Design a protein around this ligand. Sequence first.
Ligand SMILES: [Mg+2]
Ligand SMILES: [Mg+2]
Ligand SMILES: [Zn+2]
Ligand SMILES: [Zn+2]
Lengths: 446, 446
Amino acid sequence: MPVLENRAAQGDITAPGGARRLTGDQTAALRDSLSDKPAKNIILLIGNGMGDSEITAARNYAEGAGGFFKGIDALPLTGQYTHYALNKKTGKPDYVTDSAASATAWSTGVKTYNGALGVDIHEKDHPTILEMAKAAGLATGNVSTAELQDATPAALVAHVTSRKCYGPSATSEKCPGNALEKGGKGSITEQLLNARADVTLGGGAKTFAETATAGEWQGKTLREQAQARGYQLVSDAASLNSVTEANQQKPLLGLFADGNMPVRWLGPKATYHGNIDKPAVTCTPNPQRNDSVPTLAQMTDKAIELLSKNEKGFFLQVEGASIDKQDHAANPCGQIGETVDLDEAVQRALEFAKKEGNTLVIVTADHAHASQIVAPDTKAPGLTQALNTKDGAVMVMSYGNSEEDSQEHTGSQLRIAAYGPHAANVVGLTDQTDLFYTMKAALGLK
Amino acid sequence: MPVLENRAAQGDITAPGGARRLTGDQTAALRDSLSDKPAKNIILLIGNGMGDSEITAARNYAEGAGGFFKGIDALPLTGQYTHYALNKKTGKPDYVTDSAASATAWSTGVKTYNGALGVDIHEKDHPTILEMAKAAGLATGNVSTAELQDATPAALVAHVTSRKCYGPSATSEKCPGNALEKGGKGSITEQLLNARADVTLGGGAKTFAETATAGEWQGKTLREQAQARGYQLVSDAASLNSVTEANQQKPLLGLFADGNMPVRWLGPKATYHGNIDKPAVTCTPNPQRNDSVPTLAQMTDKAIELLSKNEKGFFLQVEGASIDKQDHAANPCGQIGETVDLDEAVQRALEFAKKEGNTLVIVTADHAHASQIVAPDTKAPGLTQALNTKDGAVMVMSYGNSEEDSQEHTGSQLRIAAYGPHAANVVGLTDQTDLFYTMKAALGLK
Ligand SMILES: [Mg+2]
Ligand SMILES: [Mg+2]
Ligand SMILES: [Zn+2]
Ligand SMILES: [Zn+2]
């Protein structure tokens, strides 16, 4: 199936037809993109908080307005999907979701309240697409740049009434019903160790330092439990590259940072009237990110390599987490750099899929964020910053939907694109929960 | 070709799979939506400033979060498109376009600077899709709820260096090179009268009261000139319904209001901390809305009827203008009501297209706006308001990208959806200029 090779402005932006992205009619290419045959594998790439605005800002800065992200923009089937949550007490819609509810929606097929993981408004557990995939025998992978206990990666393997329930200690006071010592299934980190996906890579080594309050591994740190349960623990790129196999007998657990893995690009924080009073910024590569710390692209590629050895097929979810984090921190450079980071991973995925032929690749976000691209002369009430793009022009970003600590989320529907068998299911308007059913039906799971 | 009959949440939002909008695999339906055959007609519906956020806000309020706009959401082929303009002096991209440059982009196929109409950065005129369609012998219609002189409807029939050049007087001092008395082609209203589309319906009767400074009709008001040039002048719904034919011999010109046509819904303006300090708002129908003033749906339906009598085919552009106007005025109810209004016109277009079979219907916006849907408890620096949705829940809207007077535009890419032959060309990432080429090619124009 054809992948959009190039959708950059074809010529001189200033001349007639020079800004065009199409070189001819697309009917035939679209026909060839449609297939209902079964999917052997599925790679779901999530850009945390990556709505259309974030994609545009990143493209403008890193590739120029007439540019083209080889990964993110290359998926042929596109659509828009709704991601509202539910109010726990009333059951009515709550228009602006958080990452927990949204992650639950696509991972279990049911709407829930803000902050829940793998449970509905009645606090009932529902099997995740990963658990189901593992049950059917497929290999499973879960990769992220955030703390593995964070919402997005946690939703696939944990069922807790509150996302804050990272380890034993926090769970005991915030999720008493889930607390291990109270007959619950355990904390997020604990349920993660139980779920046993073949490949799990990301940050969050900190919580693994906690000690189990009850159960078979009481007294032992969660890391010791991992080792004792046969997990292959990796903590740097070198070690990651050395892994030859990862399976149920010896699952891979890569903890590359105590918390969130390092951001790719550094830049100052947006300030009040920053586009007016401060000069234009040019982002700079983060020097503390390490040749020893794998990038999302490397983690993705390795994961694909190990997971592909299972002839049954595989399910892999990859998350570019810090797009959302930096967006919250009103830091344009960090936000854009993580989007660029995600793009590289989408490329890795698309390459593998293009040759394998039976892989469904999906790129989307969990929810919309606050960043907006405004006129250079804008006098906004919030935080702003001017950036020097690849076009050699200035672009101004504004974060003005919150006064408090962190810029907030928004309820706008957002882009979802797909490539491979069953991709037609992301076209037009759909809901985040349809994604669970699309992945399930594509994999022929029951 | 199938039209999305229903993509509303199929069941109980709170139950597994109840939020789903899909009821089965879409591959086959999408395959049936692909056709490369020639388009006999084209109906372009523009929601001024109607980005994904505006669409979601209006859907949440009027149809509920799991609801479905029968028009707007019913188009099967969807994608996102870029609309940046150019800096006149440098020729580099200017990330946030205004309505003039964007309307110029799709109407002529060339990028331009903010404020320009039908001319490039060198101020050179370029033929519009309407002029070209009229030349090839097709019937043409230009419909809007704004003053006919405003950017969107003007771009199809006028070529001036500044959008402010409404009539003789303003032209003489702001567009001297275009001023009739200086050998120019004339003001926006004057060129509109020259272009002679078969059907032109909208507001802006005020400028028609100005008198020609030179030329054959010097001394006469533009209204008199219209009458003298054989135009059928209509000023209300009754007269409009009475028109039996509209052609080059007797073109239809409907001036239904002095300026912009009345807004559909009334509601208070968003205020600082309005979601906190004031109660939730329920929009109410504008009593001045009227029985003698045609609605966008009525104008669209009448236009289609008159235009369809030309066997060669027709080109019609319809614009829901006040979506952007109200968005600027930080008035949620006006904004949303105009989106509901546009939806009705999209339904009429789709109905006709569905049965005619050779019509390309495109629905999109010229540029993205400011409005954002934020959490109910949000403490924003700008203007906000709480609304009582059809769900019986509260939705808060934030306007916080400008301090001054008006909320500004944004540069995020936005939704474009299509139905009919050649619709495949709106899928994936495209540029607003590609739309000119898609309509040109579809129509077989040269
Ligand atoms: Mg998130
Ligand atoms: Mg506009
Ligand atoms: Zn967030
Ligand atoms: Zn505007």
